[PDB]
Write a protein that binds this ligand. Structure first.
Ligand code: ANP
Ligand code: SF4
Ligand code: SF4
Lengths: 325, 326, 308, 281
């Protein structure tokens, strides 16, 4: 039983083109599924509007899904029962993209860290402070920082406070919504080192959401590539960065810049711009942009299939692997 | 050289204790050259560009020995004569494409205004030129695009309009401050590709300033590395990221995932960038540097010109083995 | 634009039905279908009889509405024509002696008791310096021949059908009322024009305007002032609503024929029919002015105009 | 620095603000200790002197510093007792309109939905008629008196504070720290009063000082029109009720009550922009 099962998660927000128009669904997420196991990072990669941050919000129940199943160790988290609410509130936690907006600017760092323990635990004030001090210690802040306001800290130190608040209930899963994107190179390195040291000590699993493929290449174990709310390709890090099968994965891994002249790759020349989810194209969502476009691609929606242990959704790969078509 | 910055300095605040946002920097740009400027927050990259453009406002003060562009001293020319250069021989693209265009006027007004101020001409010829110029940046259906307000564009389309508006009068130098932050990876590849096709077709110099070293290593010929408001290394793109001569450049590379053997821990420097009150005596990296020695606290390092043609602001420039030449 | 203006109508109608129900509660208490009969009364013009005059509230309202509208447009023409240039100039010259003087005088005008300011100007520039007339909309020397198709607007009627000097009387009586009433509008417009201009002069599109090599004039007039006038349009709407509070105060000391003097006299004499009907006629006109201003904001602002 | 000392260090940059605060302090000390400081009782009619000039003007008397009104009462003692009633009504108007208005604005902004529609349509109906005209309608129905004027002013000032609190709360509720506490398990009473309220407090401290300005202007206006306080009461508005007849006979009677009002309101507006300057980066 994997630590977290997602089965067919869907998020279909409804919208109005003004008063007189009929309601229409923006299918912001459709049909994602994964197994996450204890001590591993699963990475979600894709450009803007791919659904990657409506996912994560579903996994932490900031927003309720419009279909699918979400199991922690065989217990369905999507039940409304208070007996299940306590479990999901302890076990699954989030670190947000913005270090300036995710901390309350009129509370002391001690209060930002004690708030989770007031709400969820029996602990007296004397015990609560020792958990907060020991957690600041674990993320590399000082005891003297306890009384300071978040405006007294650098962007890197603010992300360490956000991580410490997440870790405060001793979780098993941390969702990380683009967590080092706003940071400079030398402080990005320290926040990445910290997150991997916490995975070695606590045994956390991360669902890590990122537009930077370098960092994913660095930290991830499995990768999900997403386009227009659907997964396009899923596999181990080794497969995705050495034998990418999907035309969009091949485009991301070539549009990503690299230092070493020996690490250059074939240039793939994507035209146009990302489809609006409010006006989605028929068939495969990449058919407006794909080099490999074939007869089925404008008619039918591709589904993930297993090719050599790597899942991919593409009618051209189906024809490469089954020449009988 | 097309541009000749010499001992440029830019200060903010009271003259008894100034914030040295740029501190005695000196660099040059040749015709048709692509120059990268790289450095983390607080490094001062943008302030040299804003000083050439005259965009440093009332609390800030620009001092230099030589700030020649195209043979014109940008510190001695009048406001009349500065407006003959800015937007017509030197032009600039900025970081946020969603706010860089004026909300209240169409894309076509904003391009046709730039043509009017430097080249004049009737409505017909200015429209035709905006059409051609939107064609040149790869806009789909230019004609129908002129009457489009900025809130109707995407971020990538809005950078393409900024490039169109900047190249309108055929400048000799194009400056780009982080043109691809907060923009998607496949759009970033298109924008840098477009700027490099324009650098080849128009023969213009391109100064490309960013925090991402990998983008610059692909695009640029020559790279300038900035720390704490001053230049710390200058050299060819191919060499600077393979045998770095300054300890900051070495650390800035070893902190990138590119050199990580899978899960092996990344290197970093201790400490933080020296802002207004934290300025060290001697070398500015001295609070942080692995190789620090007493000379580096007594005496500020010269920008030493090395035998391979590169420059390093260090007393003990790194050998090819990555160790100080004590 | 339709999917914007139709939502402004969608907020106006519940507000308007509200004022008809609350004024119904007031005329009933001083057969739910008695509300349908009362709004039939309102729509057929059958507002009550004023207890002292014994004349219908509508027959009294019309002349005084006119007389209030002259003074209102003069107060706003003064406040907008003086205020916007001073606000632009102050923001363009930030920290200058001009900027401090403009901020200080705008605080002084926004803090001022309007009735007292009128008494000080009456005392100074009609009693001690004998420069302006002390009261009234026009002097007793003006007698317009009724046979002519008079508009009821004294500036217009005396310009077209007056004898020699009668228009000069009609303007000389109006300048003190307009300056006194227009002082709070002018103070709000100078303040809101500065703050709106200074936030705009910080925006990245003005860095682009200077980077294009434009003259400072084009940067202020063309690029800055259009973005800065969006909030100015807004507050001008709040002022042309709230202006009738200044009318009650100014019309009393200046003995002006006007809605402010007719309403406060009715309140002091407990002539409930005038205040019961006049609250409906004031509140409906506030709703129409707000509705027009929102339509103006919709055409000016291209984020609202072009979205749908 | 600590938030209180950082506030003062920034507030002290605005000299005008300091001037205003000085003034404020001064008039509050006059308002408290009026019974000891003021020369004569507010109601005492002299008759050996009647409409006599200020102490420096010829035919005036140095016994009555700011001269005398038409029924023989000293202007200086009356201005000081006017200060009591004007600042006391400012306190009730601002304190009750903050308490009721901030609660309704948080209830409207956080819970949203039907509750927001009911609150905001009621506030929009309440603003469909000008401030002073709605207060006059209330006071004429219930009766002219200082208490009825203070209550009418609290009721009319309320919608402004509701609308301003809601506008601040909707800017906070979308921010990630409100979501983070919602995921952590915080209930609505905690989210409103322990998390959102201290973040939206910055505008309300500005609007408290700008609220004193409108409270004493509208109370003076009410007084002037004979609705706010009755003729014997020493109130700055009432003192100007019927004075325009004296524009030739006695300039002091028309001048000093309104100059005092202007000074007071200007002082509080000075503090208002001083607080604004101290509460943004
Ligand atoms: N509450 C919402 N109602 C309607 N559409 C929404 C809502 N939230 C997000 N969307 C749309 O859902 C699509 C994708 O969701 P979003 O989380 O924004 O994408 P992402 O790729 O995960 N993150 P980002 O990089 O910021 O675009 C976009 O078209 C959004 O505009
Ligand atoms: S399904 Fe067709 S259009 Fe889609 S990625 Fe595969 S080949 Fe391209
Ligand atoms: S000059 Fe000295 S302190 Fe500076 S980088 Fe080199 S070795 Fe380090």
């Amino acid at each position: 039983q994997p630590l977290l099962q997602a089965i067919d998660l869907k998020k279909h927000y409804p919208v109005k083109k003004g008063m007189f128009a009929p309601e229409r669904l923006v299918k912001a997420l459709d049909g994602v599924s994964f197994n996450l196991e204890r001590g591993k990072t699963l990475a979600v990669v894709g450009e803007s509007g791919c659904g990657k941050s409506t996912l994560g919000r579903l996994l932490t129940m900031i927003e309720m899904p419009t279909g699918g199943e979400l199991y922690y160790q065989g217990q369905d988290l999507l039940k409304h029962d208070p007996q299940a609410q306590k479990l999901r509130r302890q076990k699954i936690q989030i670190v947000f993209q913005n270090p300036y907006g995710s901390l309350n600017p009129r509370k002391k760092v001690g209060q930002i860290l004690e708030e989770p323990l007031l709400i969820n635990t029996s602990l007296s004030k004397e015990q609560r402070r020792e958990k907060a001090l020991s957690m600041m210690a674990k993320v590399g802040l000082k005891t003297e920082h306890y009384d300071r306001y978040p405006h007294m800290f650098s962007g890197g130190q603010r992300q360490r406070i956000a991580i410490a608040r997440g870790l405060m209930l001793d979780p098993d899963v941390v969702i990380a919504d683009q967590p080092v994107s706003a940071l400079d190179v030398s402080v990005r390195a320290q926040v990445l080192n910290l997150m991997m040291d916490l995975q070695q000590e606590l045994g956390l699993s991360y669902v890590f959401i990122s537009h930077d493929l370098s960092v994913v290449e660095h930290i991830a174990d499995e990768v999900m590539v997403m386009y227009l709310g659907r997964c396009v390709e899923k596999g181990t890090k080794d497969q995705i960065f050495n034998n990418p099968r999907h035309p969009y994965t091949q485009a991301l891994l070539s549009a990503t810049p690299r230092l070493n002249p020996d690490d250059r790759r074939e240039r793939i020349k994507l035209s146009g711009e990302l489809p609006s989810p409010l006006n989605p194209p028929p068939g495969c969502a990449f058919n407006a942009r794909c080099r490999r476009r074939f007869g089925p691609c404008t008619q039918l929606q591709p589904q993930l299939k297993d090719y050599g242990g790597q899942l991919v959704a593409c009618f051209a790969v189906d024809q490469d692997e089954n020449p009988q078509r | 050289a097309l541009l000749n910055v010499d001992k440029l300095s830019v200060h903010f605040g009271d003259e008894s204790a100034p914030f040295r946002a740029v501190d005695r920097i000196s660099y040059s740009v040749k015709q048709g050259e692509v120059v990268g400027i790289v450095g983390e927050s607080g490094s001062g990259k943008s302030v040299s560009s804003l000083a050439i453009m005259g965009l440093i406002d009332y609390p800030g003060r620009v001092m230099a020995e030589k700030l020649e562009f195209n043979g014109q001293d940008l510190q001695r020319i009048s406001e009349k004569e500065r407006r003959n250069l800015v937007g017509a021989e030197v032009a600039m693209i900025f970081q946020d494409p969603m706010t860089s265009l004026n909300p209240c006027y169409t894309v076509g007004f904003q391009i046709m205004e730039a043509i009017k101020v430097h080249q004049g001409g009737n409505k017909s010829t200015r429209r035709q030129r905006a059409i051609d110029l939107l064609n040149q940046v790869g806009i789909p259906d230019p004609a129908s695009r002129l009457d489009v307000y900025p809130h109707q564009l995407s971020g990538g389309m809005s950078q393409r309009v900024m490039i169109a508006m900047a190249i309108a009068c055929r400048p000799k130098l194009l400056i780009a401050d982080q043109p691809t932050t907060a923009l998607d990876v496949t759009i970033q590849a298109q924008i840098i590709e477009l700027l490099l096709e324009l650098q080849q077709k128009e023969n213009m110099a391109l100064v490309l300033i960013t925090h991402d070293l990998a983008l610059v290593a692909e695009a640029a010929h020559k790279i300038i590395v900035m720390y704490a408001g001053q230049v710390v290394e200058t050299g060819d793109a191919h060499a600077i990221f393979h045998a770095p001569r300054h300890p900051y450049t070495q650390a800035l590379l070893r902190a990138l995932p590119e050199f990580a053997q899978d899960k092996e821990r990344l290197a970093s420097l201790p400490g933080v960038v020296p802002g207004k009150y934290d300025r060290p005596n001697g070398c500015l990296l001295n609070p942080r540097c692995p190789y620090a020695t007493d000379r580096c606290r007594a005496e500020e390092p010269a920008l030493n010109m090395l035998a391979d043609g590169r420059q390093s602001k260090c007393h003990y420039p790194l050998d090819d083995a990555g160790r100080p030449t004590l | 634009m339709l999917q914007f203006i139709l939502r402004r109508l969608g907020l106006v109608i519940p507000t308007f039905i509200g004022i008809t129900l609350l004024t119904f509660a007031f005329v009933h208490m001083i057969m739910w279908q008695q509300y349908l009969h009362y709004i039939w009364g309102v729509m057929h013009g059958d507002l009550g009889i004023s207890m002292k005059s014994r004349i219908p509230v509508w027959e009294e309202f019309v002349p005084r509405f006119q007389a209030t509208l002259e003074l209102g447009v003069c107060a706003m023409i003064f406040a907008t024509a003086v205020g916007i240039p001073v606000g632009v100039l102050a923001a363009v010259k930030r920290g200058s002696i001009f900027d401090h003087t403009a901020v200080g005088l705008a605080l002084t005008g926004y803090s001022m008791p309007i009735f007292w300011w009128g008494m000080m100007l009456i005392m100074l520039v009609s009693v001690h310096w004998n420069l302006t007339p002390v009261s009234g909309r026009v002097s007793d020397m003006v007698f317009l021949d009724d046979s002519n198709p008079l508009t009821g607007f004294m500036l217009i009627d005396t310009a077209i059908w007056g004898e020699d000097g009668n228009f000069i009387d009609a303007v000389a009586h109006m300048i003190l009322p307009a300056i006194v009433l227009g002082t709070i509008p002018l103070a709000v417009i100078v303040r809101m024009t500065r703050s709106s201009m200074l936030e705009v002069l910080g925006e990245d599109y003005i860095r682009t305007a200077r980077a294009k090599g434009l003259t400072r004039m084009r940067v202020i007039i063309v690029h800055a002032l259009r973005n800065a006038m969006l909030p100015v349009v807004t507050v001008i709407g709040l002022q042309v609503g709230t202006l009738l509070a200044g009318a009650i105060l100014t019309e009393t000391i200046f003995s002006w024929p006007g809605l402010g003097r007719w309403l406060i006299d009715a309140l002091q004499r407990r002539d409930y029919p005038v205040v019961q009907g006049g609250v409906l006629l004031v509140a409906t006109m506030i709703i129409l002015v707000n509705l027009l201003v929102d339509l103006l904001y919709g055409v000016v602002n291209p984020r609202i105009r072009h979205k749908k | 620095m600590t938030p209180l000392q950082e506030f003062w260090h920034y507030f002290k940059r605005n000299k005008g603000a300091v001037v205003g605060l000085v003034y404020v302090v001064i008039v509050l000390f006059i308002a408290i200790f009026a019974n000891w400081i003021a020369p004569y009782n507010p109601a005492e009619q002299f008759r050996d002197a009647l409409l006599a000039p200020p102490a420096w003007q010829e035919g005036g008397s140095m016994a009555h510093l700011l001269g005398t009104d038409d029924v023989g009462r000293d202007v200086l003692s009356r201005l000081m007792y006017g200060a009591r009633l004007s600042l006391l009504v400012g306190c009730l108007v601002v304190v009750l309109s903050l308490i009721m208005g901030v609660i309704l604005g948080l209830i409207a902004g956080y819970f949203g939905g039907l509750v927001d529609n009911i609150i905001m349509r009621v506030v929009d109906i309440m603003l469909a008629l000008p401030s002073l005209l709605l207060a006059l309608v209330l006071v004429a129905i219930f009766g002219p008196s200082i208490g009825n004027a203070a209550l009418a002013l609290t009721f009319v000032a309320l919608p402004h504070y509701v609308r301003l609190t809601r506008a601040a709360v909707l800017v906070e509720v979308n921010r990630d720290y409100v979501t983070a506490s919602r995921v952590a398990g915080a209930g609505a009473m905690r989210q409103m009063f322990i998390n959102i309220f201290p973040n939206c407090l910055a505008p309300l401290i500005v609007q408290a000082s700008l609220g004193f300005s409108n409270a004493i202007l509208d109370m003076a206006a009410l007084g002037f029109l004979g609705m706010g306080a009755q003729p014997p009461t020493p109130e700055w508005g009432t003192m100007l009720s019927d004075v325009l007849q004296f524009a030739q006979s006695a300039w002091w009677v028309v001048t000093f009550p309104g100059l005092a009002i202007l000074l007071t309101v200007l002082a509080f507006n000075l503090m208002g922009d001083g607080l604004r300057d101290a509460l943004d980066p």
